[PDB]
Design a protein around this ligand. Sequence first.
Ligand SMILES: *[C@@H]1O[C@H](CO)[C@@H](O)[C@H](O)[C@H]1NC(C)=O
Ligand SMILES: [Cu+2]
Ligand SMILES: [Zn+2]
Ligand SMILES: [Zn+2]
Ligand SMILES: [Zn+2]
Ligand SMILES: [Zn+2]
Ligand SMILES: [Zn+2]
Length: 233
Amino acid sequence: HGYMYIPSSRTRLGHEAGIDSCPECAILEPVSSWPDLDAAPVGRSGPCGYNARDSIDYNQPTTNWGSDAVQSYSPGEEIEVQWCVDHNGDHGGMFTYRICQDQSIVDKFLDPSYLPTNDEKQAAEDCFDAGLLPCTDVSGQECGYSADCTEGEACWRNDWFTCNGFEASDRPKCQGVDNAELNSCYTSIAGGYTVTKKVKLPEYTSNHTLISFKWNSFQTGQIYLSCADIAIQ
Ligand SMILES: *[C@@H]1O[C@H](CO)[C@@H](O)[C@H](O)[C@H]1NC(C)=O
Ligand SMILES: [Cu+2]
Ligand SMILES: [Zn+2]
Ligand SMILES: [Zn+2]
Ligand SMILES: [Zn+2]
Ligand SMILES: [Zn+2]
Ligand SMILES: [Zn+2]
């Protein structure tokens, strides 16, 4: 149970505007989230998430999200990206961040009076996959392999980030990555823990595009998706 926190995703904004009582509850499930990290099609969830809890589809703006870039960055900028895992829903596994470089696709997600179809959701997803922001693009960032994976497997990759071992001696699962304190970010269920990394933005530009957060669960057949409205200028 988790969601994108920095820069503020639509889900965070959703919660913060009082619309979404369980931001961490937005789940793609059931799916094969492991070990093949993109076998699973995003269906209704899309690259921005659908929260069944409160029936929110974050793939289109409302008055409460998606109207504006929440943050403006520069081409090639290395930036903080953070997500929030719930104390009772730390599934371990692997996560990534992506920018889709086809403004025409993304535009379908920036109009409050249109909801992307599942078809457009999946096509967006493919675009986001092509625009995955690799761990290893940030100089100085250590990009480990998953302890829940073995060499040569489809999960064996360090473009994505990994949580710690689900049954590791020390600092297990996603919580273990920052080893942050409880409520270091908001979750509704049992209090949130931050999971913090850096990504390097592309030299691709836009006055208004999306980061899509995607977290593939190891413990469960589940994926958590969020997106943030951002500008590269
Ligand atoms: C953003 O929009 C303004 C108004 O059209 C324009 O003048 C500016 O060049 C645009 N910037 C980008 C990166 O598109
Ligand atoms: Cu969960
Ligand atoms: Zn995918
Ligand atoms: Zn695959
Ligand atoms: Zn992160
Ligand atoms: Zn259309
Ligand atoms: Zn190294």
